[PDB]
Scaffold this active site. Structure first.
Site, PDB file in Angstrom:
ATOM      1  N   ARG A   1       0.862  -1.160   0.000  1.00  0.00           N
ATOM      2  CA  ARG A   1       0.000   0.000   0.000  1.00  0.00           C
ATOM      3  C   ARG A   1       0.900   1.211   0.000  1.00  0.00           C
ATOM      4  O   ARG A   1       1.892   1.261   0.738  1.00  0.00           O
ATOM      5  CB  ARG A   1      -0.868  -0.001   1.258  1.00  0.00           C
ATOM      6  CG  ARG A   1      -1.643   1.273   1.516  1.00  0.00           C
ATOM      7  CD  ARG A   1      -2.435   1.127   2.784  1.00  0.00           C
ATOM      8  NE  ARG A   1      -3.273   2.287   3.061  1.00  0.00           N
ATOM      9  CZ  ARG A   1      -3.187   3.036   4.157  1.00  0.00           C
ATOM     10  NH1 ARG A   1      -2.294   2.748   5.103  1.00  0.00           N
ATOM     11  NH2 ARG A   1      -4.006   4.072   4.317  1.00  0.00           N
TER      12      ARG A   1
ATOM     13  N   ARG B   1      -5.599  17.407   7.252  1.00  0.00           N
ATOM     14  CA  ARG B   1      -4.311  16.983   7.767  1.00  0.00           C
ATOM     15  C   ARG B   1      -3.656  18.146   8.470  1.00  0.00           C
ATOM     16  O   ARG B   1      -3.824  19.287   8.053  1.00  0.00           O
ATOM     17  CB  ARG B   1      -3.405  16.550   6.609  1.00  0.00           C
ATOM     18  CG  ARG B   1      -3.784  15.239   5.930  1.00  0.00           C
ATOM     19  CD  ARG B   1      -3.091  14.069   6.584  1.00  0.00           C
ATOM     20  NE  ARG B   1      -3.656  12.796   6.162  1.00  0.00           N
ATOM     21  CZ  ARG B   1      -3.409  11.632   6.757  1.00  0.00           C
ATOM     22  NH1 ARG B   1      -2.601  11.575   7.808  1.00  0.00           N
ATOM     23  NH2 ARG B   1      -3.974  10.522   6.300  1.00  0.00           N
TER      24      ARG B   1
ATOM     25  N   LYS C   1     -13.027   2.822   1.221  1.00  0.00           N
ATOM     26  CA  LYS C   1     -12.700   2.880   2.640  1.00  0.00           C
ATOM     27  C   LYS C   1     -13.865   3.498   3.400  1.00  0.00           C
ATOM     28  O   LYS C   1     -14.111   4.702   3.308  1.00  0.00           O
ATOM     29  CB  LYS C   1     -11.428   3.704   2.871  1.00  0.00           C
ATOM     30  CG  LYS C   1     -10.150   3.115   2.271  1.00  0.00           C
ATOM     31  CD  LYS C   1      -8.977   4.105   2.333  1.00  0.00           C
ATOM     32  CE  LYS C   1      -8.433   4.293   3.751  1.00  0.00           C
ATOM     33  NZ  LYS C   1      -7.219   5.161   3.831  1.00  0.00           N
TER      34      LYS C   1
ATOM     35  N   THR D   1      -5.876  -1.029  10.571  1.00  0.00           N
ATOM     36  CA  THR D   1      -5.560   0.032  11.545  1.00  0.00           C
ATOM     37  C   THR D   1      -5.433  -0.449  12.978  1.00  0.00           C
ATOM     38  O   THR D   1      -6.374  -1.010  13.544  1.00  0.00           O
ATOM     39  CB  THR D   1      -6.527   1.238  11.483  1.00  0.00           C
ATOM     40  OG1 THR D   1      -6.548   1.768  10.154  1.00  0.00           O
ATOM     41  CG2 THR D   1      -6.075   2.327  12.435  1.00  0.00           C
TER      42      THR D   1
HETATM   43  N1  LIG Z   1       5.123   7.416   2.669  1.00  0.00           N
HETATM   44  C1  LIG Z   1       5.274   7.723   3.979  1.00  0.00           C
HETATM   45  N2  LIG Z   1       6.259   8.564   4.365  1.00  0.00           N
HETATM   46  C2  LIG Z   1       6.449   8.900   5.662  1.00  0.00           C
HETATM   47  N3  LIG Z   1       5.688   8.437   6.675  1.00  0.00           N
HETATM   48  C3  LIG Z   1       4.664   7.582   6.428  1.00  0.00           C
HETATM   49  C4  LIG Z   1       4.388   7.165   5.041  1.00  0.00           C
HETATM   50  N4  LIG Z   1       3.331   6.325   5.107  1.00  0.00           N
HETATM   51  C5  LIG Z   1       2.965   6.215   6.410  1.00  0.00           C
HETATM   52  N5  LIG Z   1       3.765   6.965   7.190  1.00  0.00           N
HETATM   53  C6  LIG Z   1       3.676   7.104   8.659  1.00  0.00           C
HETATM   54  O1  LIG Z   1       2.837   6.075   9.180  1.00  0.00           O
HETATM   55  C7  LIG Z   1       1.700   6.638   9.826  1.00  0.00           C
HETATM   56  C8  LIG Z   1       0.471   5.783   9.545  1.00  0.00           C
HETATM   57  O2  LIG Z   1       0.449   5.362   8.185  1.00  0.00           O
HETATM   58  P1  LIG Z   1      -0.958   5.126   7.429  1.00  0.00           P
HETATM   59  O3  LIG Z   1      -0.659   4.686   6.017  1.00  0.00           O
HETATM   60  O4  LIG Z   1      -1.875   4.285   8.280  1.00  0.00           O
HETATM   61  O5  LIG Z   1      -1.562   6.616   7.330  1.00  0.00           O
HETATM   62  P2  LIG Z   1      -2.464   7.380   8.427  1.00  0.00           P
HETATM   63  O6  LIG Z   1      -1.708   8.626   8.818  1.00  0.00           O
HETATM   64  O7  LIG Z   1      -2.983   6.441   9.498  1.00  0.00           O
HETATM   65  O8  LIG Z   1      -3.666   7.856   7.478  1.00  0.00           O
HETATM   66  P3  LIG Z   1      -4.794   6.826   6.988  1.00  0.00           P
HETATM   67  O9  LIG Z   1      -5.978   7.302   7.807  1.00  0.00           O
HETATM   68  O10 LIG Z   1      -4.908   7.049   5.502  1.00  0.00           O
HETATM   69  O11 LIG Z   1      -4.284   5.445   7.316  1.00  0.00           O
HETATM   70  C9  LIG Z   1       1.593   8.067   9.317  1.00  0.00           C
HETATM   71  O12 LIG Z   1       1.081   8.949  10.316  1.00  0.00           O
HETATM   72  C10 LIG Z   1       3.018   8.436   8.950  1.00  0.00           C
HETATM   73  O13 LIG Z   1       3.718   9.074  10.025  1.00  0.00           O
HETATM   74  O1  LIG Z   2      -7.815   5.645   6.358  1.00  0.00           O
HETATM   75  C1  LIG Z   2      -7.430   4.700   7.090  1.00  0.00           C
HETATM   76  O2  LIG Z   2      -6.782   3.713   6.664  1.00  0.00           O
HETATM   77  C2  LIG Z   2      -7.778   4.774   8.596  1.00  0.00           C
HETATM   78  O3  LIG Z   2      -8.424   5.758   9.007  1.00  0.00           O
HETATM   79  O4  LIG Z   2      -7.405   3.844   9.337  1.00  0.00           O
HETATM   80  K   LIG Z   3      -5.369   8.386   3.191  1.00  0.00           K
HETATM   81 MG   LIG Z   4      -4.454   4.597   9.753  1.00  0.00          MG
HETATM   82 MG   LIG Z   5      -8.083   7.636   6.194  1.00  0.00          MG
END
Ligand SMILES: Nc1ncnc2c1ncn2[C@@H]1O[C@H](COP(=O)(O)OP(=O)(O)OP(=O)(O)O)[C@@H](O)[C@H]1O
Ligand SMILES: O=C([O-])C(=O)[O-]
Ligand SMILES: [K+]
Ligand SMILES: [Mg+2]
Ligand SMILES: [Mg+2]
Ligand SMILES: Nc1ncnc2c1ncn2[C@@H]1O[C@H](COP(=O)(O)OP(=O)(O)OP(=O)(O)O)[C@@H](O)[C@H]1O
Ligand SMILES: O=C([O-])C(=O)[O-]
Ligand SMILES: [K+]
Ligand SMILES: [Mg+2]
Ligand SMILES: [Mg+2]
Lengths: 491, 491
Positions: A49, A90, A238, A296
């Site tokens: 991912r 964000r 999602k 998550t």
């Molecule tokens: N490409 C990236 N570069 C730097 N840090 C990352 C990257 N992907 C994820 N992270 C770190 O991992 C954490 C969690 O990753 P994740 O992919 O679950 O995103 P998220 O912030 O939880 O948003 P989402 O709600 O989309 O999951 C982020 O807060 C970030 O600090």
């Molecule tokens: O967007 C996501 O993946 C979340 O909120 O865990």
């Molecule tokens: K996202």
């Molecule tokens: Mg997350």
């Molecule tokens: Mg999200």
């Protein structure tokens, strides 16, 4: 009954010879190198991912180029997924890549696009302009999947808020802020995303994890924005807000699959109800036959420790029991200290849950909830799985080029591995999210069309023989849209 | 539940477009002519039974020659069955072809082989020599399937008994006498029978209804006596004595099918228990997949009246409900006044019972009671019937030359007609005793081998189209031992 089946279990019971649940990992600083990506693939990762809420198109390019390189060097098909930004909000970056907010301390949230690059514990950026009008003194602001909460004290100008920090916690760059019940109007399909999506089509991503989906119409806007060039790419919605859950029915209909993104959900709805939601989504996907991903904080503590808590184990297993096709690691691999150990433990918990499960029940339950009369080909898969249970067949072979037939079989949960023989290499990656399937690429451009099906079917059986699923004299069930089914002995 | 399904029924509910239960008639004076035999075939008769306890080899020859002639003139396959004498005891003939025994009257039972041809109400013959030593004053002698009973008063010489007739009733020639509990030693496979059986093989009878079977070993003695020339002929064991019921398990194993011959049974065991026995045999056959025939006195009163009693109707229907493959007419056609009307009423009662039945339950119940792991080909038939239910297929096509595959399908009780395409003409007649099957003769010696199965499968579908089972766009399931199954649309 479930209680009766629980009495027949034993800790000593030997595990299955194959894993069904599919692991998905998030590529970050801890895991971008090919030498680490190979590690994840051997540890059990099926899909990579990319979270497009972080990093540039220049960064994700490298991820793509390295995921693919690590795959070819190991000789396996690994899928690549784009995860959109969506209608999220964000925070902004921080000096030192992070901020340490303490209980009692006071902080400043400005909407000044010049506090994006610099961020103190005292002051940072939030990329929703209208923020000042959405909030009042007393209302909370949730930072980072509902972990850190700030109580708004007052304004400072027409850009900044004074905020009490109610609990201690360290936040890194770009933590998601969530405003509950605030009717927050934001582009259902944002400008940033149309850019992000078209990049996906060009590089050739296998699936889109569409963020913050809330309506059926919204999913169309995504596929329409993908263009005619990316009609073949899957759209996994999602579900992570209040309405998305309420409209799950129509979203499933339009979507190719669902993700229970619990991070954002656990803020948008009362956290105890997340549990009810999980069940509902998953089962509703199981009935439709559209893959479901649970995600998550499933193994959160393995970003720090080398061993998960008894809750975290529980979660992974219980998720597999709920019927999840896929379990997904977020921060656990992206920035974790143990990115290989976290994948191994998940693969191992998956096996254990899967072995101590009765798939036969899942099969009947799903079949019961199908509208009679079934379609021609759906009955075939149904009955051909019914065949597997009565014959104790140790493997199954399906010929699907598009991938439909393969999934439609996996829908009915057999107790053996499903070998899927396909001529198209993309279908192999795209099947890395449907449970209990392994894909074998039959090269069409150097082995012939084979409209007799003979060479392909026998190729799938060879894969089964090589992986040690079937021996000489075991049963294998073969389907080929697919409207013919055969049970054969193996040499 | 059964009680729930009863509430959903209605007298107005339209009958099925096909009959499943197979009618078997006994050919006698009322029905030996071709002009009557044609009548029986159009009225609904599937099989002609010849009772070898009456008439000469010269007589049964004519039956055979006329059954076959009536079949060819109507263009259908009608099966011919030989019904052995066995270890029975029969009375002797009478002047006037019958005797009228009255309550209170006294009669003489001699064992003098010269009172065979002449028989009064006062005196007749019983073909068991040892009779005088088997009986004592007080003991009863049962004449004619337990209808007429004589109480023994005394001896007269070393050949004759004085006997009170305890109830009024008219007996014709050669009524079966039954001695309950008398350990009566009689050739398990009698001399008369070896003669009768070898005649069957020469003329080419399709099946043997072996009388008074009591053990597994006994069935072998029959097939061994049939010789190597008649290995292909079926052996239906008539369970009609105390031990035959107790040894049903091992008898079924050796036999090709069972008949519940209730006439003799209803004397040999307490009449109320006949009911329990019926259930047991039938269901035990249903589990094995070996056809079962229910018989005797099912429509008795239609030997005299043109309309059966409410009990008699009840019986025919309830028998079909019990799971009987075949219902059989004995005296009702052999010497009845209404031989066509009696067959029509049975065919009609069969339809009604069959329409107000839920075959889907029968299918699951039978499947549950199968030893997992099933054989390769049995699973195929199972699942292919499971396919029929989910797809609401209106017909099924099976390719079986020997006939096994056809029966193995009928074993799982689908809700549509089973068209069986076979190259061998004998198999068509021999399938006239397994429920819900129609046979189509594919001429091998003038249409080619067809090892591609193409022409045969399409022939079966044409039969379905002609009989009005499937239209253009209905589903038909096709199996071909048989280890491949397909569901196809029809043009
Ligand atoms: N490409 C990236 N570069 C730097 N840090 C990352 C990257 N992907 C994820 N992270 C770190 O991992 C954490 C969690 O990753 P994740 O992919 O679950 O995103 P998220 O912030 O939880 O948003 P989402 O709600 O989309 O999951 C982020 O807060 C970030 O600090
Ligand atoms: O967007 C996501 O993946 C979340 O909120 O865990
Ligand atoms: K996202
Ligand atoms: Mg997350
Ligand atoms: Mg999200
Ligand atoms: N071929 C025949 N010729 C003359 N009468 C016959 C013939 N077949 C049957 N019947 C008459 O029909 C009656 C009943 O026929 P069925 O075939 O049931 O024999 P059964 O006497 O009941 O002996 P079983 O116990 O074998 O049935 C006989 O008692 C006989 O009078
Ligand atoms: O032998 C028989 O058929 C009987 O007894 O009914
Ligand atoms: K007989
Ligand atoms: Mg008899
Ligand atoms: Mg009888």
């Amino acid at each position: 009954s479930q209680l009766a089946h629980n009495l027949t279990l034993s800790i000593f019971d030997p595990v299955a010879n194959y894993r069904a649940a599919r692991i998905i990992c998030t590529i970050g600083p801890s895991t971008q190198s090919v030498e680490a990506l190979k590690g994840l693939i051997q540890s059990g990762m099926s899909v990579a991912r990319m979270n497009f809420s972080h990093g540039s198109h220049e960064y994700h390019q490298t991820t793509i180029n390295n995921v693919r390189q690590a795959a070819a060097e190991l000789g396996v098909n690994i899928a690549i997924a784009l995860d959109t930004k969506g209608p999220e909000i964000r925070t902004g970056q921080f000096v030192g890549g992070d901020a340490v907010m303490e209980r009692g301390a006071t902080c400043y949230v400005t909407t000044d696009p010049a506090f994006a690059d610099k961020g103190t514990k005292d002051k940072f950026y939030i990329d929703y302009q209208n923020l000042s009008k959405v909030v009042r003194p007393g209302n909370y602001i949730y930072i980072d999947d509902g972990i850190l909460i700030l109580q708004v004290q007052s304004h400072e100008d027409e850009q900044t808020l004074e905020c009490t920090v109610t609990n201690s916690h360290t936040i890194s760059d770009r933590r998601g802020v969530n405003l509950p019940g605030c009717d927050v109007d934001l582009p259902a399909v944002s400008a940033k995303d149309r850019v992000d999506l078209q990049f996906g089509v060009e590089q050739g991503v296998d699936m889109i994890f569409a963020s913050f989906i809330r309506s059926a119409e919204q999913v169309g806007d995504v596929r329409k924005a993908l263009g005619p060039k990316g009609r073949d790419i899957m759209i996994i919605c999602k579900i992570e807000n209040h309405q998305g859950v309420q409209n799950i029915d129509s979203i499933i209909e339009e979507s190719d699959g669902i993700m229970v993104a619990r991070g954002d959900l656990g803020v948008e709805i009362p956290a105890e109800k997340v549990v009810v939601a999980q069940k509902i989504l998953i089962s509703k996907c199981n009935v439709a036959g559209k893959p479901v991903i649970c995600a998550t904080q499933m193994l959160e503590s393995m970003t720090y420790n080398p061993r998960p808590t008894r809750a975290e184990v529980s979660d992974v297993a219980n998720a597999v029991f709920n019927g999840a096709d896929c379990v997904m690691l977020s921060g656990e691999t992206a920035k974790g200290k143990y990115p290989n150990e976290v994948v191994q433990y998940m693969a191992r918990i998956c096996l254990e849950a899967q072995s101590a499960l009765n798939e036969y029940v899942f099969f009947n339950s799903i079949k019961k909830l199908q509208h009679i009369p079934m379609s021609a080909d759906e009955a075939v898969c149904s009955s051909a799985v019914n065949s597997v249970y009565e014959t104790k067949a140790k493997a199954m072979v399906v010929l699907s080029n598009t991938g439909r037939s393969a999934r439609l079989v996996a829908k009915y949960r057999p107790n053996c591995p499903i070998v899927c023989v396909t001529t198209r290499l993309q279908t192999c990656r795209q099947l890395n999210i449907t449970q209990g399937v392994e894909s074998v690429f039959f090269d069409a451009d150097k082995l012939g069309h084979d409209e007799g099906k003979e060479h392909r079917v026998a190729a799938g059986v060879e894969f089964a023989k090589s992986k040690g699923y079937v021996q000489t004299g075991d049963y294998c069930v073969v389907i080929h849209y697919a409207n013919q089914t055969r049970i054969l002995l193996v040499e």
